[PDB]
Amino acid sequence: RRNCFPGDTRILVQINGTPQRVTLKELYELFDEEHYESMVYVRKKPKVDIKVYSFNPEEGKVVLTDIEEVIKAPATDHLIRFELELGSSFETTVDHPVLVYENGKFVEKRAFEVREGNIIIIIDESTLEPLKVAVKKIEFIEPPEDFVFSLNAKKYHTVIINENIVTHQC
Amino acid sequence: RRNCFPGDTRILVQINGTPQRVTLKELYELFDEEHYESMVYVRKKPKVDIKVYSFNPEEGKVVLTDIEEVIKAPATDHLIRFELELGSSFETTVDHPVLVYENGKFVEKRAFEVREGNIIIIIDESTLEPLKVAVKKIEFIEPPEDFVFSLNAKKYHTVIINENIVTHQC
Amino acid sequence: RRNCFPGDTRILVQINGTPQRVTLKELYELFDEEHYESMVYVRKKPKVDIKVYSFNPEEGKVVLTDIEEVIKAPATDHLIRFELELGSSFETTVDHPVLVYENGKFVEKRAFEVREGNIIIIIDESTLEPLKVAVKKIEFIEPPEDFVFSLNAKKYHTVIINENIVTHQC
Amino acid sequence: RRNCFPGDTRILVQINGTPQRVTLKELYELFDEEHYESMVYVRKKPKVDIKVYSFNPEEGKVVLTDIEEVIKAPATDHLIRFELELGSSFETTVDHPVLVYENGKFVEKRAFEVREGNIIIIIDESTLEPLKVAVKKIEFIEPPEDFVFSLNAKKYHTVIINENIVTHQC
Amino acid sequence: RRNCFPGDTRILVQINGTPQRVTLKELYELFDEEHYESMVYVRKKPKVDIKVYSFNPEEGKVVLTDIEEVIKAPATDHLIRFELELGSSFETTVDHPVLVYENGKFVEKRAFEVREGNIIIIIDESTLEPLKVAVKKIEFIEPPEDFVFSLNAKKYHTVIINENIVTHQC
Amino acid sequence: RRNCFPGDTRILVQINGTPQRVTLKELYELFDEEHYESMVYVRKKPKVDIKVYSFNPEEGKVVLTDIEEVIKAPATDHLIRFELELGSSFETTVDHPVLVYENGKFVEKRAFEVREGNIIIIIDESTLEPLKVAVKKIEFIEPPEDFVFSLNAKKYHTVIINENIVTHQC
């Protein structure tokens, strides 16, 4: 019954009697009592009357089933996020080279080595001039698009995405 | 000078004197004389006066350089696309199980084994009833989001994405 | 009790009282009631009195045991098969370049892009002249040599291949 | 011009004026002056007048070209070969368990740990009795079927296999 | 409860009432009744009163628990060890080139092909002269530093390494 | 001429006329003019008269050659280092669970989510009591043992490690 879905995939459920299509990230945020088990986040208690629409291939009938667990698997690796002055942002890999101004020179610096206060070269969208801006904040971030969600349901483990009956999206 | 970019990444160029931001898929479709070399598609002749904006870190100056080649690398694996009756579509992996109606039974069939004329079970978005629809067309497709583009430029190999000076997006 | 065997590996069994060596592909085709479960084909009902010869290392005795399931795992990726005129065939990878004649030119075309009616260049075995033949049929095929079989037996999970007692061939 | 071929693949060449189809293992054994360079065996001097048949797609003509190097890449990992008494052989992986008789017990022993003089249990093909045989010889062997060959030719790098014009078999 | 630890990692246990820090290799060698199961060595019977110190996060208390199994996983691949004359040793990979003297020539030979009696070139640490020494012994060895150990404990599966409460070291 | 060596591997060189064995990390720190090129750190200017001892297999003679570049390749992934109060340290993977005290509860927290000021549970080596200590510092660190060094030398690319003539240690 193990499956993988992107965060933005919409599946069809019944909450408080009415049916609708919720994104799997929303379905996760519709549970609580989070627990970091193994290498994933498991949520087992719902805070709204939840049921997932599945299919019974023995009787060939659309059916309701219980959402036992909702699972959120963090990204494998993470990116580095430089919040710079003048509002500009820069997300990149830890090994990607960043153009830095130091000691009157333009040098290529491994993103992992950039520190707050360092000068990044950016290029103004209006004037197309090289601008010297400072790194205000450095954050190791996991892009929501890199998360993998799973759904453990009782008995009937298939899920209804748009019009289709899908088992997983690994 | 080898790099990787998604198809939808916008880089800044000068065409016929004016500068603007074009997607790398557009930049590819702005060349011609295609050639399948090694395992990639190379386009070397431009049909519009093209130059890419890069950066000179010796003088610290934004500069124009020539786009020698634009490269398009096909997806690794491909998906199967079922065009069904009533307008519905279904894209999936060759090994994903598809709910099929055959011999009065609902069976799980490997997508690779589905044939035209087979009956797929779908679920109507309005009525939530199981519908029996027929496979009209079967296509092995490569999603545009799975293509990897590259840019070979002369001397200065960096590229200006929004405000940032990036080397690649591998 | 999970194992892997090529299709052509011969193991020793007793069918209808007599013992003999059957290939694992034959052993699979000696069952029925196929089911595509997970990502493999499982056959659980035998159509002939079947037992597999295994070994009891506690008493050190050759023994008979029941064949619960026979499993067939499809190839990972598949090849493209071009059936050409004049009887010639061509099996290759989806990314391998095929010599095509189009618009009076010999071009290298990604096998994935070849279509029925396209002209392939072949070389006659007798005369060694380049011949222009047409693609009559295009098939995505899985070579039997790429399939991986498994055997689930009761209690004693080893198998007798020629003279040897082997556990698997992963 | 880098390619990969199995040892048993037949390509078409001209030796001493006459054309014929030789296996790539034979083509390798038709050269000498072996050299272990990088992680492969290179042979550069031919001991017979050799030329390989290739294709000129500019003029669309079958052509002769020079075989600069023939390359033989050893298998990645190797197997263990037990030569046992009574003529029986056993090839397996270093981690596969071998049924051994020691101290009056049948034990599963990692193939890597088996030594000469150890007792292997085999099963006679005629009588189907368990036989105790001794390991006479232990050899770390590389199966010929696991070798990967390459051909470096001048200018025209394609090769004629049966009727087809193929670039590689990676 | 599955974990991985290097051989030299020290965990804290109580043997015969007194607590101390033992290396996981020592902890393995403190059990017996070895069994090669799957692809690992399992030891289940202790020859000394053993208990492992774990943590109870419900009561937040350091606790004793039973060591059910201790597991030792062999290295993936192995090295070749040349015992040479004059006491010198040489450990290397099966594919690494070894400088050999044969037929009055210095040749690079694949380590896998070196045989006993072959002449290796070494360089004396005192005089810095090239010395011709003979291969006396050839051994396929698994470096202790390449082994991966595991601990199966009852209920509480965490382990106390120095001052820290760690789950694994995969 | 591309090779890989651990940081602690000692190779034999001549500095200012005298020969000795320096670790490759020391050899790197004996150069300067660092440059982050591709995904590695290259040092090309020596600050001490350097030459590396290599071997000439044509004349069979130990020889001196020039060290063109010394290369340092950063670790693939990095660890998280928690500097805690009372002097204790904790290095772990970003996904490893850390025992945290929050809201009067002992919870398992993904190391990536631990913040400064959080309470870690450790276990005193003397008293074996659980101690509540605070995270003072959080550092993303690359262990020196995870770095891979390379040496580009002129003509003769082999290196003398102890008594042996080795090409690489990939």
Numbering used by the authors:
A (entry chain A), B (entry chain A), C (entry chain A), D (entry chain A), E (entry chain A), F (entry chain A): -3 to -1, 1 to 167
Sentences from the paper on this structure:
Protein splicing is a post-translational process by which an intein catalyzes its own excision from flanking polypeptides, or exteins, concomitant with extein ligation. Many inteins have nested homing endonuclease domains that facilitate their propagation into intein-less alleles, whereas other inteins lack the homing endonuclease (HEN) and are called mini-inteins. The mini-intein that interrupts the DNA PolII of Pyrococcus horikoshii has a linker region in place of the HEN domain that is shorter than the linker in a closely related intein from Pyrococcus abyssi. The P. horikoshii PolII intein requires a higher temperature for catalytic activity and is more stable to digestion by the thermostable protease thermolysin, suggesting that it is more rigid than the P. abyssi intein.
Instead, we resorted to single anomalous diffraction with selenomethionine-derivatized Pho PolII intein. Surprisingly, solution of the crystallography data revealed that the Pho PolII intein precursor was present in the crystal as a domain swapped dimer. The intein structure we observed consisted of monomers opened between the two symmetry-related units, with the N- and C-termini of the inteins on the same lobe of the monomer. The active site of the domain swapped dimer is compromised, making it unlikely that this conformation of the intein is catalytically competent. The thiols of Cys1 and Cys + 1 are 3.4 Å apart in the Pho PolII structure, suggesting that there could be a disulfide bond present in each monomer, as we observe experimentally and in the Pab PolII monomer. The peptide bond linking Asn-1 and Cys1 is in the fully trans configuration with a dihedral angle of 177.1°, indicating no strain in this scissile bond for the Pho PolII intein, which has been suggested as a potential means for altering the equilibrium position between the amide and thioester in step 1 of splicing. However, the orientation of the Pab PolII intein with respect to the monomer segment is slightly altered between the two alignments. This suggests that each lobe of the monomer is generally folded as it would be in a typical HINT domain, but the two lobes do not combine properly to make an active unit. However, in the case of the Pho PolII structure, iPAS is very unlikely to occur, given that there are two passages between each domain such that the N- and C-termini of the HINT unit comes from the same monomer. Instead, it seems more likely that there is an equilibrium in solution between a properly folded monomer and the domain swapped dimer, with a folded version of the Pho PolII intein with the typical HINT domain as the active species.
